[PDB]
Amino acid sequence: ETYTVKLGSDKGLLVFEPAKLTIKPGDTVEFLNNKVPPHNVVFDAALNPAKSADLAKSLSHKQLLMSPGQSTSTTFPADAPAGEYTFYCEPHRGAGMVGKITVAG
């Protein structure tokens, strides 16, 4: 169900809460900006079950999470080869802004 993955945690912490998410075969996920902007999430160009790009960046979304309290509940299809995908926050590298969804059942 649209579970919320916030981009940062308490007063400072700039991580993915949660980070490793096993959802359903075609569930809904929520992306909320918590700290230091802006956050765009691109998917597994390199790390996905059927090593493709085409679809990977057709799942990942770029909505420049920049305003303090920006939550975008989004949904996936029911095929998404039921594996551990990987979404990273474009301008925030080093500072662990990366997450994984398992579209399994």
Ligand SMILES: [Cu+2]
């Ligand atoms: Cu970020």
